[PDB]
C-alpha cells in the first residue's frame, strides 16, 4: 500500500490489514485447534513474525504499521493464554534488504545509508539471518519465552 | 504376560466408573511423564510411536 496516507485508508488497506494481522491470528488459532484435537502438547510450532522497526516513521504505508505493531501483542499473550504448548513466537525485526537492481527496494540510496555505519543485506544474507531463528539453539529459547 | 489383545479391558472402561478412574489416572500420568497415552496404545495398537521433547513439558519428559 503506497502513498496511502490516513485521509485515504479504504478497502485495500482494510483488506491488507486482514492478510497481515487478523488472518495471521486465525491461522495460529487453527494450528492450536488441530494440535489440541490430537492432544499434541510437546511439539510446538515456532511462528516467525516479520516485524518492522519503523512503525509510522515514513507514512504512505496504509495500515502496514498498525498490522506490524499489533503482532507485538503475541509476545505477551503467549504468557497470558492457553496456547504456549502449541505455539512459540519468534519475532524477526527484518532490516534493510537490497532487491534485484536500481528500481527494486531503494537500491540507489543503500550505499549512502551504509556510509552512516549501518549495514544492509543481500536477500541471501537476510535469508541466512531468519534461518538462524530455526536453529536448535534459538528453537530452544522460543520454547522457554 | 501372554494374552495381550487390542482393546483389552475397554469393554469394562465404557461401563465402569471404577475402571475409568484407573485408566484415566494412568493415561494422564504416562502423558505427563513419558509423553504417550497408554489408552491410545491399547485401543489402536500403532506400529510406531514418536515421543516429542518440545516445550517446557517436553524437556521434563526428556529428563524422565
UniProtKB/Swiss-Prot annotation, chain A:
This is Fatty acid synthase subunit alpha. Disulfide bonds: none annotated. Present with 17000 molecules/cell in log phase SD medium. Signal peptide: none annotated. The chain holds residues 776 to 920 of 1887 of the full protein. Fatty acid synthetase catalyzes the formation of long-chain fatty acids from acetyl-CoA, malonyl-CoA and NADPH. The alpha subunit contains domains for: acyl carrier protein, 3-oxoacyl-[acyl-carrier-protein] reductase, and 3-oxoacyl-[acyl-carrier-protein] synthase. This subunit coordinates the binding of the six beta subunits to the enzyme complex. It comes from the Eukaryota. The lineage of its organism: Eukaryota, Fungi, Dikarya, Ascomycota, Saccharomycotina. [Alpha(6)beta(6)] hexamers of two multifunctional subunits (alpha and beta). It comes from Saccharomyces cerevisiae (strain ATCC 204508 / S288c). Belongs to the thiolase-like superfamily. Fungal fatty acid synthetase subunit alpha family. 4'-phosphopantetheine is transferred from CoA to a specific serine of the Acyl carrier domain by the C-terminal PPT domain. This modification is essential for activity because fatty acids are bound in thioester linkage to the sulfhydryl of the prosthetic group.
From Swiss-Prot, chain B:
[Alpha(6)beta(6)] hexamers of two multifunctional subunits (alpha and beta). Present with 91800 molecules/cell in log phase SD medium. Belongs to the fungal fatty acid synthetase subunit beta family. Fatty acid synthetase catalyzes the formation of long-chain fatty acids from acetyl-CoA, malonyl-CoA and NADPH. The beta subunit contains domains for: [acyl-carrier-protein] acetyltransferase and malonyltransferase, S-acyl fatty acid synthase thioesterase, enoyl-[acyl-carrier-protein] reductase, and 3-hydroxypalmitoyl-[acyl-carrier-protein] dehydratase. This is Fatty acid synthase subunit beta. The gene is FAS1.
